């Protein structure tokens, strides 16, 4: 369903945010 | 559907936030 | 529809947050 | 409609958060 | 309506968060 | 109603987050 | 109700996040 | 119910975020 | 159900964010 798909896309967005935080961590580390 | 589309736009907003975090990481790195 | 429009406005809010993060990145860079 | 209005108020809250982030950026910049 | 009111209270919470960010900005500025 | 009450509790949680941010601001200021 | 309970658990999670922020504030201070 | 369970899992995710913040606090403290 | 599954995926996303914060903590100290 399309609503379920929208929720799954939101989840993917949150995972992208997590990756961004990991990049910040690498930036702090050096 | 329009509600599903709204959820998909929210997901895109989250992806933009992720990109902002990546830019912050680059800003720390230099 | 008005509920869908509300979701779309939320998405726009998230994009504004992303722009704020990009400004923070620029602030760190200089 | 009142639920739609609630969503629109949430969006306005997100925009205020974005402005807060922009103020942080200005604080970093000088 | 009570659900709408709940959403409006959430919006107010987000505005309080925005104010907290503005206070952080002032703290960075001096 | 109980769903409305749940939303109101979420709003209170957001207000607590705002207070946390205010404490961070005070920590930066001194 | 169980949906209401789910929302209340989310609220508790937000309060835990708030406490984490307060701990960060103490760490800065 | 499965929707309720999804909300409860989201709550657990937020608690994990809180633990991450506590780890950041420890990182600042040392 | 698929909506419930979507919520569960959101929860997993939040857990990934938590791990990112832990990585930031390690980066700080």
Numbering used by the authors:
A (entry chain D), B (entry chain C), C (entry chain B), D (entry chain A), E (entry chain I), F (entry chain H), ...: 1 to 30
G (entry chain G), I (entry chain E): 1 to 29
Would you copy out the relevant sentences from the publication that reported this structure?
Expanding this pattern to hpphhph can produce larger α-helical barrels. Here, we show that pentameric to nonameric barrels are accessed by varying the residue at one of the h sites. In peptides with four L/I–K–E–I–A–x–Z repeats, decreasing the size of Z from threonine to serine to alanine to glycine gives progressively larger oligomers. X-ray crystal structures of the resulting α-helical barrels rationalize this: side chains at Z point directly into the helical interfaces, and smaller residues allow closer helix contacts and larger assemblies.
Conversely, both Gly variants scored more favourably as larger oligomeric states: the a = d = Ile variant as an octamer; and a = Leu, d = Ile as a nonamer. Gratifyingly, one was an all-parallel nonamer, which is a new αHB with an exceptionally large channel of diameter ≈9.5–11.5 Å, Fig. 3. Attempts to model solvent into density observed in the channel were inconsistent. Therefore, representative solvent molecules were included where they matched the density; though these did not make any stabilizing contacts with protein. In addition, the crystallization conditions for the octamer and nonamer contained isopropanol. This increases the hydrophobicity of the bulk solvent, which potentially supports larger, hydrophobic pores that would otherwise be energetically unfavourable.
